[PDB]
């Protein structure tokens, strides 16, 4: 019982693009760009589509960097998040009713205003490591337990 999601991080040598979600699930936290994968769509095509819908950017080749499975206690569906990065985009990040984008220097990633698991795996993404993670949450703030391991093949 799992549902597919994508997450794209635009990660350049000295800065990363994040978006502040304004409403809905995850609102109030900085995040990459992503969402649910659609019927008849590959995961990578879904990742590219979500980047455009949410940020206004067009991506040239996505790299698989991780997979994170989220369990929220008391919710039946696990969230199977496929994480991608890119360093080459076209377009200017667009603020909309759903998302406020901002570039961050790597030393200033706003972990206090992100989902708490990001503090664990974002540093691997910054060092160009690939990973498989699992995080069990109670509510949206408490990690009850987790696993996180580096892998050679996502
Ligand atoms: N960067 C990041 N960390 C997260 N932690 C827990 C959940 C989610 C999440 C957000 C939106 N849709 C699905 C999800 F699984 C996270 N996204």
Curated annotation (Swiss-Prot):
Keywords: Cytoplasm, Hydrolase, Magnesium, Metal-binding, Mitochondrion, Nucleus, RNA-binding, Transit peptide
Bound cofactor: record note: Binds 2 Mg(2+) ion per subunit.
Nudix box, short sequence motif: residues: 35-56
GO CC field: cytoplasm; cytosol; mitochondrial matrix; mitochondrion; nucleus
Transmembrane feature ranges: none
Resulting phenotype, residue 118 to A/N: Mildly decreased 2-oxo-dATPase activity, nearly abolishes 8-oxo-dGTPase activity
Residues given in the record as N(6)-methyl-AMP binding sites: 6, 21, 115-118
Effect noted on mutating residue 51 to P: Loss of activity
GO BP annotations listed: DNA protection; DNA repair; purine nucleoside catabolic process; response to oxidative stress
pH effect summary: Optimum pH is 7.8-8.2 with 8-oxo-dGTP as substrate, and 8.0-8.5 with 2-oxo-dATP as substrate.
Catalytic reaction list: 2-oxo-dATP + H2O = 2-oxo-dAMP + diphosphate + H(+); 2-oxo-ATP + H2O = 2-oxo-AMP + diphosphate + H(+); 8-oxo-dGTP + H2O = 8-oxo-dGMP + diphosphate + H(+); 8-oxo-dATP + H2O = 8-oxo-dAMP + diphosphate + H(+)
GO molecular function, one term: ATP diphosphatase activity
Entry binding sites for Mg(2+) 1: 34, 54, 98
Inhibition and activation profile: Inhibited by 2-oxo-dADP and 8-oxo-dGDP.
Top enzyme category: hydrolase
Effect of residue 55 to R: Loss of activity
Impact after mutating residue 81 to M: Decreased localization to mitochondrion
Result for mutant: residue 34 to R: Reduces activity by 97%
Record annotation: effect of changing residue 25 to A: Reduces 2-oxo-dATPase and 8-oxo-dGTPase activities
Residues noted as binding 8-oxo-dGMP in the record, renumbered to the chain: 6, 21, 31, 115-118
Residues holding 8-oxo-dGTP: 6, 21, 31, 33-36, 115-118
Quaternary structure and interacting proteins, as annotated: Monomer.
Function: Oxidized purine nucleoside triphosphate hydrolase which is a prominent sanitizer of the oxidized nucleotide pool. Catalyzes the hydrolysis of 2-oxo-dATP (2-hydroxy-dATP) into 2-oxo-dAMP. Also has a significant hydrolase activity toward 2-oxo-ATP, 8-oxo-dGTP and 8-oxo-dATP. Through the hydrolysis of oxidized purine nucleoside triphosphates, prevents their incorporation into DNA and the subsequent transversions A:T to C:G and G:C to T:A. Also catalyzes the hydrolysis of methylated purine nucleoside triphosphate preventing their integration into DNA.
Annotated protein name in UniProt: Oxidized purine nucleoside triphosphate hydrolase
Taxonomic lineage of the native organism: Eukaryota, Metazoa, Chordata, Craniata, Vertebrata
Gene name linked to the record: NUDT1
């Amino acid at each position: 019982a799992s549902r597919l999601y994508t997450l794209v991080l635009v990660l350049q040598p000295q800065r990363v693009l994040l978006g502040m979600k304004k409403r809905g699930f995850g609102a109030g936290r900085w995040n990459g760009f992503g969402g649910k994968v659609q019927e008849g769509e590959t995961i990578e095509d879904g990742a590219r589509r979500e980047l455009q819908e949410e940020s206004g950017l067009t991506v040239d080749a996505l790299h698989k960097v991780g997979q994170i499975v989220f369990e929220f206690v008391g919710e039946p569906e696990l969230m199977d998040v496929h994480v991608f990065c890119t360093d080459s985009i076209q377009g200017t990040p667009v603020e909309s009713d759903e998302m406020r984008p901002c570039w961050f220097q790597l030393d200033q990633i706003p972990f206090k205003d992100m989902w708490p698991d990001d503090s664990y795996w974002f540093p691997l993404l910054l060092q160009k490591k690939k990973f498989h993670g699992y995080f069990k949450f109670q509510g949206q703030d408490t990690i009850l337990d987790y696993t996180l391991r580096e892998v050679d093949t996502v």
